[PDB]
Ligand binder design. Sequence first.
Ligand code: FAD
Ligand code: FAD
Lengths: 509, 509
Amino acid sequence: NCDIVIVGGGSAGSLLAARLSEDPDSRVLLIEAGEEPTDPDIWNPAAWPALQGRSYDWDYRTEAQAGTAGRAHHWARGRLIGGSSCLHAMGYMRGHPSDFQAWVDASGDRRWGWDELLPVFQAIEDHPLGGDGIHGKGGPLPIHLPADEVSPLARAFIEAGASLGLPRLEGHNSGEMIGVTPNSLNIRDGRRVTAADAWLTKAVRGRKNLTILTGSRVRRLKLEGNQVRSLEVVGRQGSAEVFADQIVLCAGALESPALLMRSGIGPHDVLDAAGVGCLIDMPDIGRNLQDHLLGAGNLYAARKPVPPSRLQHSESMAYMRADSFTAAGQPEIVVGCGVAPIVSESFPAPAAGSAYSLLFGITHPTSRGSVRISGPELGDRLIIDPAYLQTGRDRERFRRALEASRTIGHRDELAGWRERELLPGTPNSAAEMDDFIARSVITHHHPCGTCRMGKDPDAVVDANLRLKALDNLFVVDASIMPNLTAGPIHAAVLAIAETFARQYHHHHH
Amino acid sequence: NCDIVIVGGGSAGSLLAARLSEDPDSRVLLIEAGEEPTDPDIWNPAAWPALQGRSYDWDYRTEAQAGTAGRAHHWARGRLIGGSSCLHAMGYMRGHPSDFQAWVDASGDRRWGWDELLPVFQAIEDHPLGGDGIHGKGGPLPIHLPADEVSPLARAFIEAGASLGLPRLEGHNSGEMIGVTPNSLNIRDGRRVTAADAWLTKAVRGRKNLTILTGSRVRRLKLEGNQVRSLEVVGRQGSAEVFADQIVLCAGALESPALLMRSGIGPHDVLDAAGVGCLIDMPDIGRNLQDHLLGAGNLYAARKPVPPSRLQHSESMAYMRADSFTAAGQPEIVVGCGVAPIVSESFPAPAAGSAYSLLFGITHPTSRGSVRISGPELGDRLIIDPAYLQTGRDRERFRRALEASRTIGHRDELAGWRERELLPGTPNSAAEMDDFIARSVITHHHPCGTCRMGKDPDAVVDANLRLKALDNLFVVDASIMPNLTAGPIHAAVLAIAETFARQYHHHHH
Ligand SMILES: Cc1cc2nc3c(=O)[nH]c(=O)nc-3n(C[C@H](O)[C@H](O)[C@H](O)COP(=O)(O)OP(=O)(O)OC[C@H]3O[C@@H](n4cnc5c(N)ncnc54)[C@H](O)[C@@H]3O)c2cc1C
Ligand SMILES: Cc1cc2nc3c(=O)[nH]c(=O)nc-3n(C[C@H](O)[C@H](O)[C@H](O)COP(=O)(O)OP(=O)(O)OC[C@H]3O[C@@H](n4cnc5c(N)ncnc54)[C@H](O)[C@@H]3O)c2cc1C
């Protein structure tokens, strides 16, 4: 019998399959819904917005969002070995130490603090500042600090921000995140590196104690007593039952609580509505959904042609406080330089090369949404409501983000690039700004929180990532995050899986 | 002062004048030796062999070639806006990915690899397969895939090759070059399209920051310190001095190293012999000259009249390995179907309509020749020795090419066209084959390599196309190619200029 089954071979799942199978005494099975990657374009960094909407994208549609001008949103997730890492903008941001302090407060466990995560991040990273005592050296995930390849537009953006008082950082990962810098990227020798590339190497896949099962979707967990006894797996040509001593869920922010709910584990009323028998009433499963938004966008017509970028198109995020460009601390808002004229569907697209967008957002939304299954079946669509822009705090912070973006946008340092502002123009009121923001915001693609880790009775998992009501079931992916990190969450997801991997090797047999 | 002077308005120069002047902050001067095109016949695709030997052709004469039965050869180059593109057989072949791999090995820079050149080619091309993720869409250079206009002879040729195992391709540009297909052509609405037509549009020529100076020959570059300070330009009614911050050489495979040598930059001994003072001893300038040859030809008497072709007369190149019609990979030899009885001057011409030639060649000659000035003046003839057929490898490969041609030529699929083989007949020995090949080969018109890009100390330019000994001087044309591509080199030349154009917009002010 396999000692451990991992469900979902995305970011967290790939790390786990590799790290757990390092113990030759433990048999590991990885079950992944998608196929093995065959698309060449996904290893081309500049083709990243061009692969969602394709075969290996799950492509969800949220409920209409009252906070975003009644707009419904498309959430793209990866369905292949590598998960969302094969689709991602490949930016690497650990987050800010204060982001993780709130995890310690929520979990009651210092292992989720910056100080304890430091060696964890280090184990993950192969970073050119390795030796720092801060950044990792020799880890499987390459971190690349762009310098020469940074587009001239992005450099002018960086100068604009620096001149307002933002300090110059080397990447966002030293523990200091407020400031001005090119985003660090998971790139090596010009080619993007996925979590699957980094951990699921030829050598790893060759291990006898590791089995990878692709094209295979886990439909239900089967319970006996206080334990998961088996998994029903649906494959191309039939379903089958897999037995395991320990089960780790890595299906991501949407698919993990979905699998739980299909299995009879979740809010009783939701399960009833979906026609699923309730075996374990867990009211928080699917709740506390969080995501970052980006206003698309503070659009500027360009004085000269904008090139299609030597990198990943969103080259530089400037995190900052909402009220000052000089103040330090935990970020509150962000403005990013987009070397593509990125706009939501509420706006006509400008001819390519003719314009660029400053993207603006808030780093720690207080809005909280939910996901729920609509039926027992795999193909029954999830009901996703991220509750975008529902709180006054989120709306107000968003106004400051927009203002900050326009302030950076109109700097002399960008006068070589800027012909004029196309969007928003000049709103005369909070109402008009709110309306522009509502029409412009799009997902930053960081859903998380739906199986929240916490020390309170109704949290979904405890500090050890164990589902509270059962004894051999863990959730180890974005779904457990008590709160969003300031920026992109891939690194935090990887850190979650690595601390779980360590915890596992630490206690078992 | 002009920020940039471009020398030579041929293929590379036209692209550069257009692309660089897109930055309205940079003043661009294009200096072209020829006049503006006035000859109507050069926009008639079937008149292409009829315009060389005319007013706007430079018409060089090589040294007698010991490897080609002591024959001297005529090299025709364009002298007009558009350069060699106004004279060309208008075939479009990117080359094979392995061709460019050797550029990466020579330059030490991945930007010269197929993967990096892919978007470059894409930016250039307006191709009916655009959307591919391979072929370009919307670019200034139209690529036409002939179908209905392909002559019946060429179709029979294609069938002949297909029946031996060659796969059917749609053009040569997907990354797969071995196989059978009509050549793709730079044609739109029946009319040929030059590089000048494509990039130097009315709108482009109307820009205030672009000056085009025709009838003007650059005689010398003037040096101060490690920089070019000015150019001596010779016009119809006198000479004059032009100042510039940056100088880009686009004078082509012969005229670029010539201008360098006249300027005191080149092999010290060669400059002495030509009576030019040596300011910078650069031994490789003028060396590593490469060119493709075509045997003219494997001549067949026709069973019925051969029409003067609805296209460009050489409609179909079949690239292949030398030892098998079924093997894939990088080409080694080529056989092309000529809907004209093309023969070298060593053979009497057959009456028009009475015969056709299969043209045969090797794709990657290992022979290396040289160009050198014979004096300081513009009208002092270049000494050109391409060293045709000097290596045993080139001679041996050529025998396989001839054999392949005769094998295709005698196929049942061509029995409707073939009356009998006129040339070579049947040689009984390697010696007799070598002699026939030596008398029959003519230039394919792809000279290149004379200012070779490389990472070694004595290369002429570095990976960035900057002349190694100076700080503001670039060479951006066929002269920089480390090696020939498998087929015609226009696309590669255009790719060279486009990656330079991108590199320029990327770093300056
Ligand atoms: C377009 C896009 C761009 C992004 N860019 C960035 C970025 O630039 N920087 C950053 O930090 N983050 C980025 N992210 C977010 C980051 O990629 C994700 O947060 C991270 O990959 C989450 O990892 P995960 O393990 O929680 O889930 P995933 O990586 O999504 O993995 C879940 C896996 O489980 C599989 N699965 C799901 N259900 C089942 C089932 N029932 N049975 C079997 N298998 C199943 C899925 O097919 C998938 O492989 C981006 C996300 C997207 C969509
Ligand atoms: C007859 C013929 C047919 C061809 N057919 C094909 C084909 O079918 N497919 C293909 O891919 N390739 C073909 N080629 C090759 C292709 O045309 C050339 O390789 C390509 O045009 C090279 O471009 P270039 O910029 O390096 O030089 P060119 O296009 O030759 O441009 C050089 C320019 O510099 C100018 N110049 C030179 N010296 C000076 C000076 N000192 N001062 C000012 N100006 C100067 C010249 O007048 C000319 O305009 C053909 C070539 C020929 C001759």
